[PDB]
């Protein structure tokens, strides 16, 4: 039986096997259709397939709500190459084409197998007629909500349009619903299940955050009389893990300020570890230079703002050290996780000072209240704040670092085996926190 899945995956989409074991399970449980389904994988862990493929293997049509026209086009083009008759009804569509597709959707055996559609379109009463005749003939095998996170106000990109989708799902009792996003805290997940009226049990396929080979720890800048030297020592332990090869691989140090990058890259260089500053302040050429130097391991350490790491794809990144705490636990996972891509053991470390925290907490309250004066009030302004607080907690609390990150993102207790300062030495991390008290 499962072969028709493998068969179509290969014969249509031209991959022999799935991208990850979870993609297989997700797609396979969408196939059965006995449960509604949530898929939460980072962009490009192959979420599209988890519905694009079952859509072809199902009796009737598969309708896909995607929030932007931009996103729809990308997929239509790709599906058209796979010789799939995929249609899109949106804002952008031509007066004649609109009426010509509507006619197609009315035919017994409509040419369309997969209909992509704006949430705007889905609510518009001008469309409800087409919807009803399809609902009537029970010609819906699957409803799919892409970018499910737009239903939540705690999401980064709430679209009111998406609130109406849940009522529609209930009208489509016949068919299972598939909901997908990359980004969902547990509060966003429950918001996604509630406001879409998904039918329990919901099978959830959620790419966990935990990575076996990464050792997270936190050091408290205020406890360290030679901080620049402590960072140097750290960078070298991490790079120095092939005694015969000397410096194997490279690492990143993340800073807030462009100033601090320039300054720190220097302090590190002089203290032993060759390092170059990267940030949007530099000339396009000087950047591509510093990247390339870092890339070919000519200069193994790069001190950068959140500019850097965007599509780097350097595998052997042995350390990611945050000189300044990050604006969000979101940001810290993304930043730190550029480490150890090749899967060889790596070190993520966060330099916490209360002095840093206060600066940032201040700057978020400014940038937020500045937003509330320009665009008025929002609920995602609280997620913005609580997102930072979660990371401060991570530093100010005793307890497994991977667990702490798993908690925030809604991942199951992770299999951390002496893979974080706390689990390795719970007492010494207590000793170090007890100490931060006395500073102030």
């Amino acid at each position: 039986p499962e072969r028709r899945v493998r068969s179509t995956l290969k014969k249509v989409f031209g991959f022999d096997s799935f991208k990850t074991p979870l993609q297989e399970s997700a797609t396979m449980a969408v196939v059965k259709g006995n449960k509604d389904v949530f898929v939460c994988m980072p962009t490009g862990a192959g979420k599209s397939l988890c519905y694009q493929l079952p859509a072809l293997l199902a009796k009737g049509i598969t309708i896909v709500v995607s929030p932007l026209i931009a996103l729809i086009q990308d997929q239509v083009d790709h599906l058209l190459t796979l010789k799939v008759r995929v249609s899109s009804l949106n804002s952008k569509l031509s007066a004649q084409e609109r009426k010509e597709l509507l006619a197609d959707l009315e035919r017994e055996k409509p040419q369309t197998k997969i209909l992509y559609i704006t949430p705007e379109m889905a609510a518009s009463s001008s469309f409800q007629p087409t919807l009803n005749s399809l609902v009537s003939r029970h010609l819906l095998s699957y409803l799919v909500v892409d970018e499910a996170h737009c239903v939540s106000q705690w999401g980064h990109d709430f679209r009111p349009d998406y609130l109406r989708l849940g009522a529609l799902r209930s009208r489509l009792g016949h068919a299972p619903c598939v909901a997908l996003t990359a980004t969902a805290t547990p509060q966003v997940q429950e918001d996604v299940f509630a406001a879409l009226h998904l039918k329990k049990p919901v099978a959830i396929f959620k790419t966990p955050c935990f990575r076996a080979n990464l050792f997270y720890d936190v050091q408290f800048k205020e406890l360290i009389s030679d901080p620049y030297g402590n960072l140097k020592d750290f960078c070298l332990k991490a790079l120095g893990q092939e005694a015969d090869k000397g410096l194997s691989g490279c690492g990143i140090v993340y800073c807030r300020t462009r100033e601090a990058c320039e300054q720190l890259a220097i302090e590190l260089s002089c203290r032993g570890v060759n390092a170059k500053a990267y940030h949007a302040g530099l000339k396009a050429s000087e950047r591509t230079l510093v990247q390339n130097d870092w890339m070919e391991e000519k200069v193994p350490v790069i001190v950068a703002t959140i500019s850097f790491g965007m599509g780097v794809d350097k595998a052997n990144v042995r350390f990611v050290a945050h000189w300044n705490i990050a604006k969000s636990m979101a940001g810290y996972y993304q930043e730190s996780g550029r480490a150890g891509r090749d899967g060889k053991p790596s070190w993520c470390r966060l330099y916490y000072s209360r002095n840093d925290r206060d600066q940032v907490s201040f700057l978020i309250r400014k940038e937020v209240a500045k937003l509330q004066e320009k665009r008025g009030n929002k609920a995602s302004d609280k997620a913005t704040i609580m997102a930072f607080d979660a990371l401060v907690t991570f530093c100010e609390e005793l307890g497994c670092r991977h667990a702490a990150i798993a908690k925030y993102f809604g991942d199951a207790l992770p299999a951390c085996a002496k893979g974080c300062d706390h689990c390795q030495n719970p007492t010494a991390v207590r000793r170090r926190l007890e100490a931060l008290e006395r500073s102030s």
């Epitope: 919901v202 099978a203 935990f210 809604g410």
Partner: nanobody, 124 residues
């Protein structure tokens, strides 16, 4: 799937107290709400009390000020302290875990509601 197990039921002289419990076992991350219900023989099920994540409580008027709903969220175990028991309180008390989020380290996980067998309360 998840085992809801009630405990602490019994007979008491009216005016007495009981303390009922609800252990949810399984790969549980969080539960939207746990609600205590009572069903007397051939009588409609009655909503007694509810606790959400963050300890937001909600109680029926029939019981407000006699009943107290606690949670050791560490033990994922909710309690109903029942003081001043009346014979009208006699029924089968059971919890529902509403919005129950299980997950595996693998990323496979289930959001479902889950219902206990019950425990008998009887008041002379």
């Amino acid at each position: 799937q998840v085992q809801l197990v009630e405990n602490g039921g019994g007979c008491v002289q009216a005016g007495g107290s009981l303390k009922l419990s609800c252990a949810a076992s399984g790969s549980i991350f969080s539960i939207n709400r746990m609600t205590w219900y009572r069903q007397a023989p051939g009588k409609e099920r009655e909503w007694v009390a509810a606790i959400t994540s963050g300890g937001s409580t909600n109680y029926a008027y029939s019981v407000k000020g006699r009943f107290t709903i606690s949670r050791d969220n560490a033990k994922n175990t909710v309690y109903l302290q029942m003081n001043s028991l009346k014979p009208e309180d006699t029924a089968v008390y059971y919890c529902e875990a509403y919005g129950t989020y299980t997950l595996a380290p693998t990323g496979e996980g289930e959001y479902d509601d889950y219902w206990g067998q019950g425990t008998q309360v009887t008041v002379s």
